[PDB]
Paper text:
TrefLec was searched for original domain combinations, which led to single out SaroL-1 in the choanoflagellate Salpingoeca rosetta, that contains both β-trefoil and aerolysin-like pore-forming domains. SaroL-1 is composed of two domains, a β-trefoil domain at the N-terminal region shown in blue and an elongated domain (green) consisting of seven β-strands forming a twisted β-sheet. The lectin-binding step is necessary for the pore-formation since the pre-incubation with a high affinity galactose derivative diminishes or abolishes hemolysis, GUVs penetration, and cytotoxicity.
The complex of SaroL-1 with the Gb3 trisaccharide presents the same packing as the one with GalNAc. The terminal α-galactose of the trisaccharide occupies the exact location and establishes the same contact as GalNAc in the other complex. Electron density was observed in binding sites β and γ only. Site α is not occupied, presumably because of close proximity with the neighboring monomer in the crystal. The second galactose residue (βGal) is perpendicular to His98 in site β and Tyr146 in site γ with hydrogen bonds involving ring oxygen O5 of galactose. In both cases, an acidic amino acid (Asp43 in site β and Glu92 in site γ) bridges between the two Gal residues by establishing two strong hydrogen bonds between O6 of αGal and O2 of βGal.
Residue numbers in the entry: 4 to 327
Write the structure that this text describes.
Amino acid sequence: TFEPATDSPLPVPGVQYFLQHVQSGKYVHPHGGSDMPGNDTALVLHHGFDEKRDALRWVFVNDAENKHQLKHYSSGKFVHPKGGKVGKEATLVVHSSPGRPETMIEMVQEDGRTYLRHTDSDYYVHPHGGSPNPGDNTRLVYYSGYRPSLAFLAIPAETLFVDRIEIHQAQALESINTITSLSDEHRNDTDQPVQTSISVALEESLQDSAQLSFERCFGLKVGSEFEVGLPLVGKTKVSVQFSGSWKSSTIKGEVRTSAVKVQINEHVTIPPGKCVQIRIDTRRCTKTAPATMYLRTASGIEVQRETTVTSTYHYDQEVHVVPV
Ligand SMILES: OC[C@H]1O[C@H](O[C@@H]2[C@H](O)[C@@H](O)[C@H](O[C@H]3[C@H](O)[C@@H](O)[C@@H](O)O[C@@H]3CO)O[C@@H]2CO)[C@H](O)[C@@H](O)[C@H]1O
Ligand SMILES: OC[C@H]1O[C@H](O[C@@H]2[C@H](O)[C@@H](O)[C@H](O[C@H]3[C@H](O)[C@@H](O)[C@@H](O)O[C@@H]3CO)O[C@@H]2CO)[C@H](O)[C@@H](O)[C@H]1O
């Protein structure tokens, strides 16, 4: 189950988020709720939420023009300290002016929780008055220091595409095993060699699996199913379809193809008066690999998320006729 106390993800720049004060469950709004808030309009906490409400969307910006800043999505205004310098009890406001070093703001992780902090300072974002459960329209201010009641959750507010997942080949660990299976015995009780068909079913013992796992939670919305190629054995690509939620720290995959058979039917020449069986050796690669996810916004912005790919894949298989 999802717990923000351990699982709140760090937001990726360029992506739309809602911002929620964890302990009150309130969202960060421009005071008054406008899609076009006025310059020096205060950021406040308010219970009000609808997924369709663009006035509640925020985007972290980190580039040459705006290094460590925070943008109101619907207006394009930046989050500034009222008056233009961070200090004690400076109200967070929107303003249609570029960010500066003295306005920098980002989400940070401190002791296992996520906070808003003015970069290169000990000033963090507090509800004015410092209530752990502030009421609607409580303004957000900079103030020195943090504590758990101040934590925020950046909830993803748009749906991204998964373009590819590239494993870090130097950190990939592979453990190989052989799964060995035997058919029913077949006897040729005649005095002449005989063509016979020996069949065996192995669905249960050759089951493939795969998953992505995350330190906090995945933290991004990509829809109910996505498919990518992953190197489940050496560099060999196998398509895996994943179904999960932004809140999951483990996203289960379904391995979509197999290089091996789970129903075997072998044409055997059985010598006179001999008994034989088929032996099936199937190789299994259990793999763990740190990887980088390559994602993309509808607007064409390319973002990255680190993960770990864990998998079990049956990849080569051999069939031998053996005496009983
Ligand atoms: O407050 C954040 C803002 O501080 C500095 O801007 C100056 C004032 O502090 C700010 O109050 C003032 O706001 C103007 C806005 O420019 C006008 O369109 C109009 O909407 O009235 C308000 C007054 O409420 O603007 C001045 C500078 O023009 C920083 O320069 C700015 O970047 C932010 O950090
Ligand atoms: O507002 C965030 C702040 O709330 C609590 O602090 C109290 C007041 O809310 C805060 O305004 C007040 O600030 C003092 C400041 O300590 C003094 O140095 C001087 O500037 O006066 C202001 C009042 O304008 O401080 C009190 C607590 O003394 C929380 O305790 C604090 O941690 C923040 O979350």
